[PDB]
Structure formats: structure tokens, C-alpha cells
Design a protein around this ligand. Structure first.
Ligand SMILES: O=c1[nH]cnc2c1ncn2[C@@H]1O[C@H](CO)[C@@H](O)[C@H]1O
Length: 288
């Protein structure tokens, strides 16, 4: 929790409320290369993290680190264009601040996306992996967003992540994929968070294999964790941007500077996939 008081979150959320007529239901966190989904909002109301009261400003992106509200396919959203990462220096309680605000804003669902490397060989760069589970490497060692005093107004001391990635929405995505009838099937697996800005080495790559990870990335888990702590329904995808080199040859590089995957049609399609799923995110009314 550290660094922010409960009322820090309340003041930010209230400030936001009194600044946008929008009252969101779905928060979407766009990963690298998937920031275009903001283009699909309507009645978009843009804010810089910096204009917003206690919001972590971005370390480099004075280019485009911002929060946009709007409606996407009949859903009252709010999207983070450019998320916070541990490797940039953000303590995990800053990286996830957004989520605690989203909850107070009235958000009841959080869809998170990220670009990940591929560990499972079945994966093809471009592949979109549905996140079924995660291996929280930093958390195993204290680097868990929930560290420090717990606020029962947000959740319990010991929340369970046994069930973080909403089951329902995974069926819906598996199917919505098919509805679209899109050739290659939407993948699904286990996402391993890993910090430090550098990329893996063949040997590290093989330990992540052993551990049972299908994709490796440097974000998402902190956000997923506090979403759950809050009671947010959570689901997310991972854009396989490269194949992590699991052998001592290959050369087929795994890369960000080589994030053309995330700057490709590949990214473009995850953007409409996420737009379609808006229709399948349950309304707060439930209804009938
Ligand atoms: O092979 C990989 N290992 C670890 N993270 C990766 C890999 N490939 C992509 N990313 C993801 O890409 C972003 C930089 O473009 C990083 O933020 C990371 O989450």
C-alpha cells in the first residue's frame, strides 16, 4: 500500500469524477503497440497523468502517457495509453495506483494487455495469448503490490489469485475469436512476470520454460493483483512480439526495438478483438 493514503485514492477518483461526465465501467490498460485502441473511443475525454492529482507522471513519454475516457462498443471505458513498469523505477504501489483509482471511479472490470515474448514453442510471433494464469516472480520475493498495511476498504489481507483471470470471459474470448472466424486460434497459457529492463539469456529462457511459463513479460501481474484485491473481474491478452531464444544458435531475435509486431496488423487485430469483447463484458445491471 505505502506512499499513498486511502484518501489519496479518494481525492484522485473524486477529482476525476468532477472532471469528466463519464463514469466508466471498464478500465483497459494498453500494452506496447496496442495503444491504438484509444482511437476507437467515442466522446473521448483525454487527460495527462500529470494533470491528474496523485497520478504517477511518465518517465519518458511526454509523447503520450495519458488516460482517455469514452465509450467503446457500448461500454463506458477508461484507457491507459502507456502503462507504468517496475524497470522504470516505479515502486509497485505506484505502478498500480491507477487500478485503485479505477475501482473508486466505479470500474468493475479491468482488461489488461501487454506484449510478451514466447516461451511455448507452439507460439508464433503475432500470436495472441489469452492469459489463463501467471507466475509472479517478483512477488515471490516481496515485490508484490499488496505489501504493507492492508486496507479492508479495498480488500482482504490475504487475497487469492488462484482465480484471477476470469473464467467466463475466457470462454467468451475463445468463442468471440471463432465468431470472427479468424483462421489461427487465439492462444492461451501462463504469463511469467519478470522485471529488469534487459532481455533474457538462453539459460534464463530455459528456467522460465521449466517453471511452466508460455509467455514472459515485464508488467501486468501487479495490476491484475490489485484488481483482484479490489474485486475487479480480470481478463487479458498478451501480444507475442518475439520468440525468446531458448537455444544457443537461432539469431532470430526477440525484441522491442523490433516491436514492429506490436506496430503491425498483429496489434491492429487485437485492438478490434478487444473492441468486440466489450459487448460480452457484463453490465453492472446484470439484467436477464
Ligand atoms: O522476450 C521478451 N522478454 C521479456 N519481455 C518481453 C519480451 N518480448 C517482449 N517483451 C515485452 O516487450 C516490452 C518491450 O517492447 C517490455 O515492456 C516487455 O513487457
Amino acid at each position: 500500500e505505502n506512499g499513498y493514503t486511502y484518501e489519496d485514492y479518494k481525492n484522485t477518483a473524486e477529482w476525476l469524477l468532477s472532471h469528466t461526465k463519464h463514469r466508466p465501467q471498464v478500465a483497459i490498460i494498453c500494452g506496447s503497440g496496442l495503444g491504438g485502441l484509444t482511437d476507437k473511443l467515442t466522446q473521448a475525454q483525454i487527460f495527462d497523468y500529470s494533470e491528474i492529482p496523485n497520478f504517477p507522471r511518465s518517465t519518458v513519454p511526454g509523447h503520450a502517457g495519458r488516460l482517455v475516457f469514452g465509450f467503446l462498443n457500448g461500454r463506458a471505458c477508461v484507457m491507459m495509453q502507456g502503462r507504468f513498469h517496475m524497470y522504470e523505477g516505479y515502486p509497485l504501489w505506484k505502478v498500480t495506483f491507477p487500478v485503485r483509482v479505477f475501482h473508486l471511479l466505479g470500474v468493475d472490470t479491468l482488461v489488461v494487455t501487454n506484449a510478451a515474448g514466447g516461451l511455448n514453442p507452439k507460439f508464433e510471433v503475432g500470436d495472441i495469448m489469452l492469459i489463463r494464469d501467471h507466475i509472479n516472480l517478483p512477488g515471490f520475493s516481496g515485490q508484490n503490490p499488496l505489501r504493507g498495511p492492508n486496507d479492508e476498504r479495498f480488500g482482504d489481507r490475504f487475497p487469492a489469485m488462484s482465480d484471477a483471470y476470469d473464467r467466463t470471459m475466457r470462454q467468451r474470448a475463445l468463442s468471440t475469436w471463432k465468431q470472427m472466424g479468424e483462421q489461427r486460434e487465439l492462444q492461451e497459457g501462463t504469463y511469467v512476470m519478470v522485471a529488469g529492463p534487459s532481455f533474457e539469456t538462453v539459460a534464463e529462457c530455459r528456467v522460465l520454460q521449466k517453471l511452466g511459463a508460455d509467455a514472459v513479460g515485464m508488467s501486468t501481474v501487479p495490476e491484475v493483483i490489485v484488481a483482484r484485491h479490489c474485486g475487479l473481474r480480470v481478463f487479458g491478452f498478451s501480444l507475442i512480439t518475439n520468440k525468446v531464444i531458448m537455444d544457443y544458435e537461432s539469431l532470430e531475435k526477440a525484441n522491442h526495438e523490433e516491436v514492429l509486431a506490436a506496430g503491425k496488423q498483429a496489434a491492429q487485430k487485437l485492438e478490434q478483438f478487444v473492441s468486440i469483447l466489450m459487448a460480452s463484458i457484463p453490465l453492472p445491471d446484470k439484467a436477464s
